[PDB]
């Protein structure tokens, strides 16, 4: 799996063996053009106060 | 985990024991900002020919 791991569109890192989920963190209460976070995950992370998480299981899908 | 499981904004199910992801399938191509499939997921589904899938892990996040 390769995931997007910056805010920008062609930098991606190959995910460690545990990790099988790209996530993308997105500012909840105020709309933004670029994500706040992007990386690999083992378990898809729960939403918090500030940030809204969304995951997928496919190369370069975040 | 309660996920939306229908095409409409309210109806949700209690996800069966051991399905701790909600998913939302959208039409991969066009600007239909509304889901073609939602429900509970064991592992987050891969992208398909025509749908793009997307998972999250809090109640009713999909």
Swiss-Prot record, chains A, B:
GO cellular component: extracellular region; membrane; other organism cell membrane
Keyword set includes Signal: yes
Location (main, coarse): secreted
Name of the protein: Cytotoxin A5
Family named by the database record: Belongs to the three-finger toxin family. Short-chain subfamily. Orphan group XV sub-subfamily.
A GO molecular-function descriptor: toxin activity
Compartment annotation: Secreted; Target cell membrane
Bridged cysteine pairs (disulfide): 3-22, 15-40, 44-55, 56-61
Tissue: Expressed by the venom gland.
Summary of the function given for this chain in its UniProt record: Non-cytotoxic protein that does not show lytic and hemolytic activities, but can induce aggregation and fusion of sphingomyelin vesicles. It binds to integrin alpha-V/beta-3 (ITGAV/ITGB3) with high affinity, and it inhibits osteoclast differentiation and bone resorption in mice, probably due to binding to integrin alpha-V/beta-3.
Keywords of the record: Disulfide bond, Membrane, Secreted, Signal, Target cell membrane, Target membrane, Toxin
